[PDB]
Amino acid sequence: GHMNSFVGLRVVAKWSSNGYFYSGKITRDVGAGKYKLLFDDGYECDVLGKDILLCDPIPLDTEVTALSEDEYFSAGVVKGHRKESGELYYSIEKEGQRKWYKRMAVILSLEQGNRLREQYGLG
Amino acid sequence: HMNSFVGLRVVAKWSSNGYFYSGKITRDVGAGKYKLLFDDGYECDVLGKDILLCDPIPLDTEVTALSEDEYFSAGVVKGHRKESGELYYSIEKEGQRKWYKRMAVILSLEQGNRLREQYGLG
Ligand SMILES: CC(C)(C)NCCCNC(=O)c1cccc(C(F)(F)F)c1
């Protein structure tokens, strides 16, 4: 049947308006460097392969941004990841304190995502 | 006598066929538009009719609760509480209740259309 392809892979992919990379999954390999991306909020749009990071999970010791109520730019460092009942969580350290976050709350600024492009950029 | 909703939390639709997502009004732009900061950091202008001035989402509202690989899971708001300054909703689905963080509780296109009359800023 279907041969494994990039379809169905979980990734973090760049949002053009603000340059941040958000958790999502590739739903279609459209061709010519374009992909259809389903972000974890249910929104789907086209994203270029150069703007997709093949991170599932984001690796240890990565600088990331962790969303929480009324906080949009909280930088932290990945210190672990675990699955709790089919859901990925990240352990994020900030100034010697740790909180566990669901996958979709962990995003990357442009600068944070660029640190991962060489190793993890799709195309 | 004047009301200004800048700084207040809302649930709002930014794309023509989109869901309504948790956010905050950051500016009254004019022409029936407001600048919206969604909880994920995306900021854009939104028509007032697509903004629901709800915080918290009311008891017994039909909602959609996000979780990994769950995009359409409908449920009903049955309670809410703050844990360390963060709102969580108790969501009932098929007679069982689970707690979800605010940003994960969204309204489908139709679920939001249905509150526009009472809570919409149109
Ligand atoms: C930029 C982007 C298209 C992803 N969102 C647009 C603004 C509305 N979405 C949210 O506020 C939201 C809610 C829950 C989860 C997430 C996600 F980060 F996981 F995608 C996002």
Domain boundary among B41, B57, B73: B57
Q: Report CA-CA distances (Å) from B122 to A14, A30, A104, B29.
A: 32, 38, 31, 14
Structure tokens at B100: 């979800």
The resolution, in angstroms to one decimal, equals: 1.6
Task: Please check whether residues B43 and B66 belong to one and the same domain.
Answer: no
Q: What's the CA gap between B122 and B109, in Å, rounded?
A: 16
B78 within 8 A of B90, measured Cβ to Cβ: yes
Strand partners, B120: B52
Task: Please check whether residues B35 and B46 belong to one and the same domain.
Answer: yes
| HSE-up (13 A, CA, CB side) for residue B40 | 28
Q: Which CATH number fits the domain that encloses residue B27?
A: 2.30.30.140
Task: Please check whether residues A54 and A65 belong to one and the same domain.
Answer: no
| Elucidation method | X-ray
Of A38, A43, A69, the CB nearest to B102: A69
Number of separate domains in chain B? 2
Contacts of A84 (CB under 8 A, 6+ apart): none
Q: Which atom of ligand 1 is nearest to the CA of A23?
A: 19
Q: What's the CA gap between B115 and B50, in Å, rounded?
A: 10
A12 within 8 A of A97, measured Cβ to Cβ: no
Structure tokens at A30: 């459209």
Cβ-based contacts of A73 with chain B (< 8 Å)? 41
Cβ-based contacts of B42 with chain A (< 8 Å)? 15, 17-18, 20
Task: Please check whether residues B92 and B114 belong to one and the same domain.
Answer: yes
Q: What's the CA gap between A103 and B1, in Å, rounded?
A: 44
DSSP B109: H
Q: What are phi and psi of B98, to 5 degrees?
A: -135, 150
Task: Please check whether residues A25 and A63 belong to one and the same domain.
Answer: no
Structure tokens at A78: 């990945």
For chain A, what is the radius of gyration of the CA atoms?
14
Range of the domain at A9: 1-58
> Is B116 in a helix, a strand, or coil?
helix
B68 within 8 A of A87, measured Cβ to Cβ: yes
